[PDB]
Design an enzyme around this catalytic site. Structure first.
Site, PDB file in Angstrom:
ATOM      1  N   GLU A 173     -48.654  30.801  -2.716  1.00 54.23           N
ATOM      2  CA  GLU A 173     -48.576  29.398  -3.117  1.00 54.23           C
ATOM      3  C   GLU A 173     -49.288  29.158  -4.449  1.00 54.23           C
ATOM      4  OE1 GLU A 173     -46.765  27.211  -2.074  1.00 54.23           O
ATOM      5  OE2 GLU A 173     -47.528  25.339  -2.927  1.00 54.23           O
ATOM      6  N   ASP A 174     -48.742  29.802  -5.480  1.00 50.33           N
ATOM      7  CA  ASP A 174     -49.139  29.711  -6.882  1.00 50.33           C
ATOM      8  C   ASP A 174     -50.395  30.509  -7.206  1.00 50.33           C
ATOM      9  OD1 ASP A 174     -47.111  27.902  -6.662  1.00 50.33           O
ATOM     10  OD2 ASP A 174     -48.269  26.149  -7.301  1.00 50.33           O
ATOM     11  N   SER A 175     -51.057  31.119  -6.231  1.00 49.37           N
ATOM     12  CA  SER A 175     -52.224  31.937  -6.516  1.00 49.37           C
ATOM     13  C   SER A 175     -51.813  33.358  -6.903  1.00 49.37           C
ATOM     14  CB  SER A 175     -53.157  31.966  -5.309  1.00 49.37           C
ATOM     15  OG  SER A 175     -53.757  30.700  -5.109  1.00 49.37           O
ATOM     16  N   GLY A 311     -51.793  29.747 -11.992  1.00 48.60           N
ATOM     17  CA  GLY A 311     -52.233  30.147 -10.663  1.00 48.60           C
ATOM     18  C   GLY A 311     -53.695  30.537 -10.564  1.00 48.60           C
TER      19      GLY A 311
ATOM     20  N   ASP B 141     -50.789  22.487  -3.645  1.00 48.66           N
ATOM     21  CA  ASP B 141     -50.641  23.878  -4.039  1.00 48.66           C
ATOM     22  C   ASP B 141     -51.956  24.398  -4.629  1.00 48.66           C
ATOM     23  OD1 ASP B 141     -50.441  24.305  -7.144  1.00 48.66           O
ATOM     24  OD2 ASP B 141     -49.365  22.440  -6.776  1.00 48.66           O
TER      25      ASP B 141
END
Ligand SMILES: [Mg+2]
Ligand SMILES: [Zn+2]
Ligand SMILES: [Zn+2]
Ligand SMILES: [Zn+2]
Lengths: 419, 505, 52, 78, 115, 66, 258, 47
Positions: A173-175, A311, B141
């Site tokens: 999740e974007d990391s 991220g 997010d």
RNA sequence: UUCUGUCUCGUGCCUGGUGUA
């Protein structure tokens, strides 16, 4: 105030820019032939927006001036290179024409937040909030327009072996997962400099400010800080480790005396880099102190790509724990595959593929947007000559069990930036 | 109506799938800073007694002692041993520790599930870690987001939070009676891949995946295949995750509409039509249809049948067992998922060229006044409608042809049929053709005098002249349609910037 | 108290051979801010030696 | 002759555990054997489940009347 | 500021048991071995060696949280052979395998150089 | 700023190869043959010398605060 | 039930790398042995730097970091040195460290390259890899810049910091042909042959072998110059053997400790 | 017992500047000055 | 059958600009 741009002139279906100009221009080091001569010879012209409503403009001469069934046949100007429509931050993006436009916009925004050596005299400047990378690098895949931005000489990022794989769920999740061993070796290590300015003054007939080591026998209002870290000067010494609530400049204002010292901002924890003492316009003593802090990239640090892929570092694993190829190549950053499909940053993938060819061929790859001579299939044909899967995939072995993971992971050098 | 509050912290959030859905991984410095006043009482006086000795320096220590007369004793100054003594009526402001209830918020607090309460688990590295499934409630997010942690300061308040706002109690929302937390993002792709009919595991791999079920009763199920070699099916392990005895019927995304009518109705050839009976998965592949935040989904049944605690575990188990199998299966996306085998490219090119010819014919009819104005519309409006229809048909047909050419191992298809991220339109744009770029619902306007760019000729209503991008993101965009794509994408950014202020009011 | 603000070297345990200045000191343990790392650890005063 | 619902609302249960826990923290006698847990919330919860909490809920009606309900009289939800 | 020192992955604190055994309650003959300050380097070999034992019904391991320095190996064997001895033996002879490998590699090396 | 001591990805020492690489490039070697001469086979190591920019040469232009 | 019988066969042995093949061993054992090569193999590396004076354009921590990463010839001293944290002496001693000194000042007009040749050592067996080719550039100095520092190299292993990692790159690989289908290729013919493929150029991957375990684990351990590449492997085996002997000790005690 | 030595700017020459003194270099009169490195112990992990 | 330790929570504010989700 009229905004205009240079364009090539087209008198018949032919450019006025003939090979003699290019040849003279190529020699501009020996003879000083330059842009001025190109303009003076009437080969180039500055067209303005109000004038551009009446010019018929080709994009590229080599295709839009020959014909099969005539489209225009009356061009008056020709674009120098269509990539000149981009700005400074938008022209460092490799393959921006393979990206969704909001991604290009977000990269233009983040390209101004990426750390790097911001100027060569950074050790002289007493600037507030300065960040410089230990080891910034030239991108392996560049646009031809970043040569004029001088990005090759003052870059902001590092080419990292990016593996776009969902690994162990923290690259999520974007990391992004990072290689702790790579970090240890200084990957994305940067130093953060903060500057404190302070000046003494004649407050009035009765009150005066002076730099002196405050002493409790004379100074009221003292706090729990260790003033002893200061030398008799009253200014912290270069090379001294400081932390939150430590006194940096021992200013005292006479009433016996009140402690009016300036303290390091809470929770900063740096080392004094340099202390400069001088006089301001008013002729009072003035000192700027710069405190450096080494920021090893940890979890939660925001890393971005040149395609809009912001991220935070989700977790860091040792090299023993990272997935590895048939040889000892582990990714430096593992990014979530689910970042690509919805944001359609295919230029990211094309960069990760051409950077691979760039590192194998031993040449910096060209990612100028409207090339038409650089397409995915030709890169793949190049890549398969170096003993690689033509699409960039590789067979990774799980770092924890050593067993091959049934899916072949897309991996290759990608220029990652530290925000 | 809105104040600044003590006992509050803020940090960058980062993912952590190993935390329970109702747990937040706070860093050590925050836990060491925020305190909870615990009344001294015989049941705990000794625990606090030594805790107080530890002082403010050591983390599992305390910061103040508040005497019954209100006299606060600061432990940051290592006071005389006589003041460190505490008796029944005093309060110890101990540091935050594991299990402490905290209420966690993201500032666009749009609905009730934006301030769910979590149990704390202290972890290293300075970030607020939270379980992946809680992303959807907060809409948070991990690209750099920050969230606020509020620590309740009394038992009467902790109790209220624990019994009213705790995360598992917030699985189902009154807004639409459906769940708001579901198996989402990566683990949905992994569980779709895991529940296929052709997933088999050795004793060595299942005995390792079962290590991650908390609610497993410890007895390995009889493997669906005994000879020639013990083999467990993915659905067999996944049945161990489904709690209690749930009973629901859902359909997988790729289920043919004409399958329920013909034969093979109760025995689907493609393994669609999820069927869960007696708490076991009998058929089907799991996707957003059956594990997502949708009415009648499997998690919805789990919540309506089982309490909110068994469903809390069901969530955590799905995540842990599927992510543990994702280390074996692996998942990626790359250039190989965008290439279209050079047979589908011929179809794409032919379709686009035919569509361009059709638009040209419509333009000839319009220029010759052979085009009749349809009812309500004007002639120019009917012409624009005709051209938009032709170009929409072109884009949709090229995309559809792209869909059927994708191999079963294509990772775009794996992420689209799972419902985790993306849509078939994204595959169409990446592989076949991007399509028409509109601003305010119309094709690109004549910004210059009677033309869209200086590169086109006046009164040019053709596809590429008005914004129809005929290339794909893999093949790259011609400069004119690059700028048109920028114009089209700018609308999304403008709407995003202006809508927020109108809707918040 | 007594050695607050002095420069100490850690002679035992996991932080052996570390240099730091003292920021707090009790009868048994002291808080040392390490010269190298951006951290201030609590360590037992019997593990510390004074370098000055 | 009471008309309110004979079930304990989630709010009633919450405020009861909150207040009763706080009283236990102030060592008011506990109504049920501590097996040895010490968190007042866990004890208050144990009481509730054993239906021994000594609290009556005064439920105000919109007209101004009220009905006292012993915690042992109405039905717990969870 | 909150970075753990790297030594915490292998250095023993005050009170930490190198290994802690607890019986498992849900089934007969099953224990949970909790290694403190260890990771997958030790977890995969012990898990795999336990599986070669024909008397081992179940053998596997997990790291309860990756930032927690604790791992859990779970073993369950036939009722006529306690999990404790299953572990003990699988290490008793795993040590032999590594010694056998040391001896065989040492001779192969001396045989390669001028041979 | 200065050539990294070790390749970030694998750990091969590349800090002793920047001067050699410059000398090879002073000869007419193509950077790919230069990298092969220096023994850098893996692309992770080749990335170190191809992408390195020696800014310490610019920082040395300034007179020191002796 | 009992221990399997492992074998070894070195195919190439240089002063930089070893290519060897291990037979009759578990998939886990072969990967754990790899992991030990990366993390759990002690070497000597600089872990303590007292910067007396630094006026170079590089910062004190920059210099320290770079010094930490310099590989030292750790072949006989590393197995004899005591871990610094385990050593009883106050500060440092020969029993737990190797002292280093670097006092350099640039006075000549040309820029001085402060390579690892300037790192003087108190021991003749532990020095930067310079025995018998250019040296690791630590700093570039202008006229009037100096760098004077004391350093101590400690015995450590790659699990604590990458500086103590003795390998440049470990190429672990098994089952070159896809006989076990542990990896499934969408198009098996697009994939180049492995270096160890016992396969003709006609077929793409070996026919599926249903009943078959992984054996013949191919390794390519490349050293960073610190340890001889074969000594890295021996150091792994002795260290893992110790880890199991000690773990069995702690386990046996925990059984009796009821 | 130091007279408080500073380093000039454009000169780079050590000057003794006490309190209540104007910061001026002994030679050329430049007003910018830098403090010399501390004498305190500086130790790093080299990590 | 000369004394002597006696130190414990200090604080700007407005305005404008850039940036984060
Ligand atoms: Mg975000
Ligand atoms: Zn490398
Ligand atoms: Zn010693
Ligand atoms: Zn001067």
């Amino acid at each position: 105030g009229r905004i205009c741009r240079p364009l090539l002139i087209v008198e018949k279906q032919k450019l006025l820019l003939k090979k003699r100009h290019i040849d003279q221009l190529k020699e501009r080091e020996y003879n000083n032939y330059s842009w001025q001569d190109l303009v003076a010879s009437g080969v180039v012209e500055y067209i303005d927006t109000l004038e551009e409503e009446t010019v018929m403009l080709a994009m590229t001469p080599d295709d839009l001036q020959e014909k099969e069934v005539a489209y225009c046949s009356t061009y008056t100007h020709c674009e120098i290179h269509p990539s000149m429509i981009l700005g400074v931050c938008a022209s460092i993006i490799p393959f921006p024409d393979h990206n969704q436009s909001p991604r290009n916009t977000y990269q233009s925004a983040m390209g101004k937040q990426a750390m790097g050596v911001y100027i060569t005299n950074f050790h002289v400047r007493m600037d507030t909030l300065a960040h410089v990378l230990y080891y910034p690098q030239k991108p392996l895949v560049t646009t031809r327009s970043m040569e004029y931005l001088r990005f090759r000489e003052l870059p902001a990022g590092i080419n990292s072996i990016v593996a776009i794989a969902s690994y162990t769920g923290y690259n999520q999740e974007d990391s992004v997962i990072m290689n702790r061993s790579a970090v240890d070796r200084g990957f994305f290590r940067s130093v953060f400099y903060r500057s404190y300015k302070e000046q003494e003054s004649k407050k009035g007939f009765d009150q005066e400010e002076v730099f002196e080591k405050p002493t409790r026998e004379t100074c009221q209002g003292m706090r729990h800080a260790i003033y002893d870290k200061l030398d008799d000067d009253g200014l912290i010494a270069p090379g001294v480790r400081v932390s939150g609530d430590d006194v940096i400049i021992g200013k005292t204002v006479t009433l016996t005396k009140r402690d009016c010292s300036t303290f390091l901002r809470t929770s900063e924890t740096g080392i004094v880099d340099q202390v400069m003492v001088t006089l301001n316009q008013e002729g009072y003593k003035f000192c700027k102190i710069r405190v450096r802090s080494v920021r090893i990239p940890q979890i939660g640090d925001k890393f971005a790509s040149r395609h809009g892929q912001k991220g935070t570092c989700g977790i860091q694993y040792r090299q023993e724990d990272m997935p590895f190829t048939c040889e000892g190549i582990t990714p430096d950053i593992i990014i979530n595959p689910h970042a690509i499909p919805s944001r359609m940053t295919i230029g990211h993938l094309i960069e990760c593929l051409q950077g691979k060819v760039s590192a194998n061929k031993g040449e910096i790859g060209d990612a100028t947007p409207f090339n038409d001579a650089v397409n995915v299939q030709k890169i793949s044909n190049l890549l398969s000559d170096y003993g690689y899967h033509l699409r960039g995939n590789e067979v990774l072995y799980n770092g924890f069990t050593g067993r091959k993971i049934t899916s072949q992971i897309f991996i290759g050098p990608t220029y990652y930036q530290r925000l | 109506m809105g104040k600044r509050v003590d006992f509050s912290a803020r940090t960058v959030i980062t993912p952590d799938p190993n935390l329970s859905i109702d747990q937040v991984g706070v860093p050590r410095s925050i836990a060491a800073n925020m305190t909870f006043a615990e009344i001294v009482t015989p049941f705990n006086i000794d625990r606090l007694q030594e805790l107080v000795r530890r002082g403010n320096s050591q983390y599992p220590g305390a910061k103040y002692i508040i005497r019954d007369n209100g006299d606060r004793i600061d432990l940051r100054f290592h006071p005389k041993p006589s003041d460190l003594h505490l008796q029944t009526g005093y309060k110890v402001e101990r540091h935050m520790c594991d299990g402490d209830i905290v209420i966690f918020n993201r500032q666009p607090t749009l609905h009730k599930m934006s301030m769910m309460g979590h149990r704390v688990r202290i972890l290293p590295w300075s970030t607020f870690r939270l379980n992946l499934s809680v992303t959807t409630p907060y809409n948070a997010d991990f690209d750099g987001d920050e969230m606020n942690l509020h620590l309740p300061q009394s038992l009467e308040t902790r109790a209220e939070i624990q019994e009213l706002a705790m995360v598992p109690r917030m699985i189902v929302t009154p807004q639409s009676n459906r769940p708001v937390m579901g198996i989402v993002q990566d683990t949905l792709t992994a569980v779709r891949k895991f529940t296929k009919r052709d997933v088999f595991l050795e004793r060595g791999e299942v005995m390792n995946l079962l290590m991650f079920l908390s609610t497993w009763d410890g007895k390995v199920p009889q493997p669906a295949i005994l000879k020639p070699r013990p083999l467990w099916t993915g659905k067999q392990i996944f049945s161990l995750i489904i709690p209690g005895h749930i009973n629901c019927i859902r359909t997988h995304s790729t289920h043919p509409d004409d399958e329920d009518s013909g034969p093979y109705k109760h025995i689907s050839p493609g393994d669609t039509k999820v069927v869960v009976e007696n708490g076991e998965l009998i058929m089907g592949i799991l996707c957003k249809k059956s594990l997502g935040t949708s009415a009648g989904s499997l998690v919805h049944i789990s919540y309506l049948e089982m309490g909110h605690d068994i469903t809390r575990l069901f969530y955590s188990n799905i995540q842990t067992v599927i992510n543990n199998w994702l280390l074996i299966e692996g998942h990626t996306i790359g250039i190989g998922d965008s290439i279209a085998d050079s047979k589908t490219y011929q179809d794409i090119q032919n379709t686009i060229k035919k569509a361009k010819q059709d638009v040209i014919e419509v333009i000839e009819k319009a220029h010759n006044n052979e085009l009749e104005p349809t009812p309500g519309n004007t002639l120019r409006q009917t012409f624009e409608n005709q051209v938009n229809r032709i170009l929409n048909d072109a884009r949709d047909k090229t995309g559809s042809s792209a869909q059927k050419s994708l191999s079963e191992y294509n990772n775009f298809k794996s992420m689209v049929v799972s419902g985790a991220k993306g849509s078939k339109i994204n595959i169409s744009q990446v592989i076949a053709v991007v399509g028409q770029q509109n601003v305010e619902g119309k094709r690109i306007p004549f910004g210059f005098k009677h033309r869209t760019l200086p590169h086109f000729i006046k009164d040019d209503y053709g596809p590429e002249s008005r914004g129809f991008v005929e290339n794909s993101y893999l093949a790259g965009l011609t400069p004119t349609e690059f700028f048109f794509h920028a114009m089209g994408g700018r609308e999304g950014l403008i709407d995003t910037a202006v809508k927020t202020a109108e809707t918040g009011y | 108290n007594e050695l607050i603000g002095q420069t100490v070297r850690i002679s035992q345990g996991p932080y052996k051979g570390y240099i730091g200045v003292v920021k707090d000191a009790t009868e048994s343990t002291a808080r040392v801010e390490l010269h190298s790392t951006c951290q201030t650890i609590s360590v037992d005063r019997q593990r510390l030696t004074t370098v000055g | 002759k009471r008309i309110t619902t004979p079930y304990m609302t989630k709010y009633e249960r919450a405020r009861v555990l909150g207040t009763r826990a706080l009283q236990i923290a102030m060592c008011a006698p506990v109504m049920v054997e501590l097996e040895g847990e010490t968190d007042p919330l866990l004890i208050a919860m144990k009481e509730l489940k054993a239906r021994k909490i000594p609290i009556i809920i005064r439920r105000y009606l919109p007209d101004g009347s009220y009905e006292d309900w012993g915690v042992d009289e109405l039905i717990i939800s969870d | 500021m909150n970075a753990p020192p790297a030594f915490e992955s292998f250095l023993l604190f005050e009170g930490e048991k190198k290994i802690t055994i607890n019986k498992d309650t849900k089934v007969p003959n099953a224990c949970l071995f909790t290694i403190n300050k260890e990771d997958h380097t030790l977890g995969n070999i012990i898990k795999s060696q336990l599986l070669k034992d024909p008397q081992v019904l179940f053998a596997g391991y997990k790291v309860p949280h990756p930032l927690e320095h604790k791992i859990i190996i779970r073993v369950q064997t036939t009722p006529d052979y306690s999990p404790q001895e299953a572990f003990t033996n699988a290490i008793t002879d795993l040590i032999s395998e590594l010694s056998l490998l040391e001896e065989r590699f040492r001779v192969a090396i001396k045989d390669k150089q001028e041979g | 700023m200065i050539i990294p001591v070790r390749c970030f990805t694998c750990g091969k020492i590349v800090g002793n190869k920047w001067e050699a690489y410059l000398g090879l490039l002073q000869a007419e070697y193509t950077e790919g043959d230069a990298l092969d001469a220096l023994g850098l086979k893996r692309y992770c190591c080749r990335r170190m010398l191809l992408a390195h920019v020696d800014l310490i040469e610019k920082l040395l232009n300034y007179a020191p605060l002796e | 039930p009992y221990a399997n019988q492992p074998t070894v066969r070195i195919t190439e042995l240089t002063d930089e790398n070893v290519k060897f093949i291990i037979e009759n061993t578990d998939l886990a054992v072969a990967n754990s042995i790899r992991r030990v090569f990366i993390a759990e193999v002690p070497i000597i590396a600089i872990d303590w730097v007292q910067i007396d004076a630094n006026s170079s354009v590089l910062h004190d921590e920059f210099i320290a970091h770079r010094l930490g990463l310099i590989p030292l010839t750790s072949d006989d001293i590393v197995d004899k040195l005591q871990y610094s944290r385990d050593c009883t002496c106050e500060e440092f001693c020969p029993e737990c460290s190797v002292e280093f000194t670097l006092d350099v000042r640039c006075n000549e007009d040309q820029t001085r390259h402060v390579t690892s040749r300037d790192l003087i050592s108190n021991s003749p067996r532990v020095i930067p890899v310079t025995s018998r080719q250019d040296d690791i550039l630590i700093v570039k100095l202008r006229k009037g810049q100096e760098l004077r520092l004391r350093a101590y190299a400690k015995k450590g292993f790659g699990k604590e910091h990458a500086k103590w990692n003795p390998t440049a790159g470990v190429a672990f690989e098994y089952d070159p042909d896809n006989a076990l289908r542990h990896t499934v290729y969408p198009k098996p013919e697009e994939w180049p042959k492995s270096e160890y493929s016992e396969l003709d150029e006609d077929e793409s991957q070996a026919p599926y072998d249903p009943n078959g375990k992984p054996e013949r684990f191919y390794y390519n351990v490349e050293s960073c110059g610190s340890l001889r590449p074969e000594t890295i492997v021996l150091s792994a085996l002795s260290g893992l053997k110790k880890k199991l002997s000690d773990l069995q000790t702690q386990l046996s005690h925990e059984i009796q400790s009821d | 017992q130091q007279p408080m030595i500073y380093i000039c700017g454009e000169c780079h020459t050590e000057n003794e500047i006490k309190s209540r003194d104007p910061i001026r270099c002994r030679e050329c009169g430049y007003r910018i000055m830098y403090k010399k490195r501390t004498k305190r112990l500086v130790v790093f992990d080299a990590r």
